[PDB]
């Protein structure tokens, strides 16, 4: 009876694709065909943050738009003051292989994890005056690839065991577990209202999840290879994905399908990181060619290149006030562009 | 300096953090790191008599070896973490002919990986005693799995250990030559393979790793100064 289930799945997919095609009246290229180009978008490196020993995998901006946290395989997190280029905190880790780090929106905690399948929460503000491990969340069966805070007592994680999870930090237990991906989940992006979030995995698939119920609302396909980075458009009705396909794609939640693609014939390397500007007009994406490209999201036209690193651009971020862009690379350097 | 007193104290704190980072820099740059690969039944667990991590010491040089085993079958993504390591130590069971082609394919995949294009490989052909016993017994035949064994002759530079049979030497050097011919097709001089014959009782493995790491460092330094 397996063939019956398979044919039911195929029929359902055919119904989904025809229902989707019933809405493609026009494309974003035609809708935004009469828009003035943004023009030459040139940025310069204002700060260069030096001090890490090995490749940097993760970074995260603070809500104040001034303090940021970065993670290196030497076994250290560093909190940098961007304005003064000062080191505020240097946190040694118990495991050298760290792949992600997050900064709490309140600013009282940081998180990290990696090949040790553990998510560590460090309390930044203690009476003793030093950073100490606040909690050690265990339960994933694969490397922790991403983590994002909701508040001081909730965190969402994605792992290499093809699942995501929502935790209660006080009890150290998984309040919810999100399953459905058939490959390693690489990145996740929380909604501005902290109600929904997407995950992209190494199966050319992105999934939209509701945190309160714990079910996959919609599934987006269209890539040809592993998705490495994912990020919402500011209003929350669209998101952008980058992959080893060497193409970025824009998906809209309401239309349940992609609207625009971003690629060039010269580009043959995959996208490691992706982010949006404050207004969503620019899409910033870092590649394996040691460069970041700026795309006119509404026109799919490249508008500029950030070329200052000498190795793979591993992490990228944009401040909450949209005033600066931070790019961290495998050459052990993190740069601020404005 | 157009700085407030608290700004100056923050600067001083950052300076102390930098001093600690410099000390950690010396400590970190002193130690060699190795990645241990090889399927099960190969005996990679017991190669050094000194399991996610392991420390050992050889003549005032520190080696730190990592065996990643608590993950899934797919290794396409996390393997990228190990692209700064000095060496990948690949262990292959040399007695089982039923799973040797899998070892060859794995070694090929590691050798040609984009993020492992500069890492050298120390190859340990483990379990030589079992291979010798199986060869002298005659029950198993390499020709069944590798037809090229018939049209093979022992190398001119092959060394026989004192007391042995030529068939055993032929088998050993055929096994070594398979990995070697895999290794001499895309290396381009950027990275090399160091094959060794080791049994279970062998205790020289650490010294071989030490010498191989010395050679790897010398080649890397020559290339960096653009002399080779």
């Amino acid at each position, epitope marked *: 009876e397996l063939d019956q289930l398979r044919q039911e799945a195929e029929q359902l997919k055919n119904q989904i694709r025809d229902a989707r095609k019933a809405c493609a009246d026009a494309t974003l290229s035609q809708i935004t065909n009469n828009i003035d180009p943004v023009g030459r978008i040139q940025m310069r490196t204002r700060r260069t943050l030096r001090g890490h020993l090995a490749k940097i995998y993760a970074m995260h901006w603070g809500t104040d738009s001034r303090l940021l946290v970065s993670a290196s395989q030497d076994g250290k997190l560093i909190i940098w003051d961007s304005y003064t280029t000062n080191k505020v905190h240097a946190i040694p880790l118990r495991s050298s292989w760290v792949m992600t780090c997050a900064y709490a929106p309140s600013g009282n905690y940081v998180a990290c994890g990696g090949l040790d399948n553990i998510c560590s929460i460090y309390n930044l503000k203690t009476r*003793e005056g030093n950073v100490r491990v606040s909690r050690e969340l265990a339960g994933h069966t694969g490397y922790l690839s991403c983590c994002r805070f909701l508040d001081d007592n909730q965190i969402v994680t994605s792992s290499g065991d093809t699942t995501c999870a929502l935790w209660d930090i006080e009890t150290g237990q998984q309040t919810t577990t999100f399953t459905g991906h058939t490959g390693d989940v690489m990145s996740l992006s929380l909604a501005p209202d902290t109600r929904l979030f997407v995950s992209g995995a190494c199966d050319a698939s992105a999934k939209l999840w509701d945190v309160r119920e714990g079910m996959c609302r919609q599934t987006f396909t269209g890539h040809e290879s592993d998705i490495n980075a994912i990020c919402f458009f500011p209003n929350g009705n669209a998101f952008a994905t980058g992959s080893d396909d060497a193409t970025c794609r824009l998906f809209d939640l309401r239309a349940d399908q992609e609207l625009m693609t971003y690629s060039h014939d010269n580009i043959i390397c995959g996208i490691t990181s992706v982010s949006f500007s404050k207004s969503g007009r620019l899409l910033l994406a870092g590649y394996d060619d040691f460069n970041c490209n700026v795309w006119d999201a509404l026109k799919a036209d490249r508008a500029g290149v950030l070329a200052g690193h000498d190795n793979r651009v591993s992490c990228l971020g944009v401040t909450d006030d949209g005033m600066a862009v931070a790019t961290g690379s495998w050459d052990s350097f993190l740069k601020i562009w404005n | 300096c157009t700085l*407030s007193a608290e700004d100056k104290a923050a600067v001083e704190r950052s300076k102390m953090i930098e001093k600690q980072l410099q000390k950690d820099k010396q400590v970190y740059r002193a130690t060699h790191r190795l990645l241990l690969l090889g399927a099960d039944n190969s005996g990679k667990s017991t190669i050094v008599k000194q399991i996610f991590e392991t420390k050992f010491q050889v003549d005032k040089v520190n080696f730190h070896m990592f065996d990643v085993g608590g993950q899934r079958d797919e290794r396409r993504k996390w393997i990228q973490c190990f692209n700064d390591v000095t060496a990948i130590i690949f262990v292959v069971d040399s007695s089982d002919y039923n799973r040797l082609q899998e070892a060859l394919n794995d070694f090929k995949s590691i050798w040609n990986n984009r993020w492992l294009r500069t890492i050298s490989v120390i190859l340990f052909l483990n379990k030589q005693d079992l291979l010798a016993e199986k060869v002298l017994a005659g029950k198993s035949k390499i020709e069944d799995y590798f037809p090229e064994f018939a049209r093979y002759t022992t190398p001119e530079d092959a060394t026989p250990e004192p007391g042995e049979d030529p068939r055993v030497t032929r088998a050993k050097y055929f096994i070594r030559d398979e990995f070697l011919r895999i290794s001499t097709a895309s290396g381009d001089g950027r990275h090399y393979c160091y094959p060794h014959f080791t049994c279970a009782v062998d205790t020289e493995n650490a010294r071989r790793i030490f010498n191989d790491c010395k050679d790897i460092i010398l080649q890397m330094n020559l290339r960096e100064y653009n002399l080779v």
Partner: single-chain antibody
Amino acid sequence: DVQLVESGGGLVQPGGSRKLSCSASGFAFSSFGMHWVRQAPEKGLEWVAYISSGSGTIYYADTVKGRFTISRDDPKNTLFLQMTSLRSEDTAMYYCVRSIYYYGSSPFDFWGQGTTLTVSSGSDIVMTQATSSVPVTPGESVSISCRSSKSLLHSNGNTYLYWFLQRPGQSPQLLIYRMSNLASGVPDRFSGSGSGTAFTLTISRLEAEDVGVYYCMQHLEYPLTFGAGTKLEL
């Protein structure tokens, strides 16, 4: 928890020497800078010396230069004030204060108990507290005014004013740092406001625990200067 217990006080003859010790526990002593602050009998608070974390920077008050010296022993978590040529003017109670400096921190947060020492018989910012005493009943709201000789608003945008409270027979406690921030563990009812050279502290729903002496201090430049003190007698 945090302790900064001080010892070494007593009665001394004039022109003598004395060593004051401050033993700390429950916190990372090495990462904290240390201050000595002396309170004269029935007078205000006066700053003495500052040792930085790592001993890289040392500041002394002009009244104690040459005669006093500060030192620390990070392995043993102990602070030392060696004193020579003691005068009658040095008779005061010596508090030992901790202060950590980085972006977004609260210096002068914890003060030690103190120790009593008895002696037998110009480009300095001046802080002025208008009222030396304020009569008020519980449940009302009261304001304390502090004036500065020079603008405390620095080009970085931080107005370095600190508000402390000394309850009777107790060491001072931090209430406000940098003129707006509320220190950890301090009730919400306290609020701070100010503009450049005039600052106000507002205390809604005044209660019994809030009666004491209030001090305003500036951290813009060394030496550090305290106000005269406002005593909110019930």
